[PDB]
Write a protein that binds this ligand. Structure first.
Ligand SMILES: Nc1nc2c(ncn2[C@@H]2O[C@H](COP(=O)(O)O)[C@@H](O)[C@H]2O)c(=O)[nH]1
Length: 196
């Protein structure tokens, strides 16, 4: 009998999917385990190694890849990101729903993986592209090239999301409203789920 399907959250940079995920984990902390991805990008000052990501250098990312540690990986905006088999295994051992956050290429890979039989895939959209571009611009500290790459990824992502096979599309206009919608979708999708 099938394991409980992982929850997979995808969307463009600047859409607020990280905050939505933190709200899910806040309401349902005993029910989900967040998959801590590896990334080669620089850690921001209030991110934490071993909570948000495992921040590694590109050499160590390549070593991990070649040693067979990843279920999927991609290059996004000049850095590498990857989902560890061990992190999915920890969720499974704990009897929890694994919660992944990954980009559209990672989604495509997970859907073809023989390690995971099914999943619930959600794409988070902005209220408008203009609003999202404005949100990216409000990141005072990111370099123009970094913003540039994230906006280039946005174009691809918005173009392809319709073709990938998401179970649900949600528009993050306001966190309270959007989370109220999201939690009802999750409760409907996971009859096993309750708060706490
Ligand atoms: N394919 C893949 N994408 C990831 C992974 N972790 C984060 N990402 C994606 O990479 C993009 C950039 O993440 P950020 O640098 O903004 O944290 C986001 O779309 C994020 O969801 C991963 O393990 N695999």
């Amino acid at each position: 009998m099938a394991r409980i399907p992982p929850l997979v959250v995808c969307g463009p940079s600047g859409v607020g999917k990280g905050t939505l995920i933190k709200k899910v984990l806040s309401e349902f902390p005993s029910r989900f385990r967040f998959s801590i991805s590896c990334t080669t990008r620089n850690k921001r000052e209030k991110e934490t190694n071993g909570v948000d990501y495992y921040f590694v250098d590109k050499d160590d990312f390549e070593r991990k890849l070649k040693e067979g540690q990843f279920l999927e990986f991609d290059k996004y905006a000049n850095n590498f990101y990857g989902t560890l088999k061990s992190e999915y295994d920890l969720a499974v051992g704990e009897g929890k729903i694994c919660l992944f956050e990954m980009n559209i290429n990672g989604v495509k890979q997970l859907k073809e993986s023989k390690h995971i039989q099914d999943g619930i895939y959600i794409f988070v959209k902005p209220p408008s592209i203009d609003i999202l571009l404005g949100r990216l611009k409000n990141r005072n500290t990111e370099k123009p090239e970094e913003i540039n790459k994230r906006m280039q990824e946005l174009t691809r992502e918005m173009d392809e999301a319709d073709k990938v096979g998401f179970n649900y599309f949600i528009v993050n206009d306001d966190l309270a409203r959007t989370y109220a919608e999201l939690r009802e979708y999750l409760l409907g999708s996971y009859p096993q789920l309750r708060g706490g």
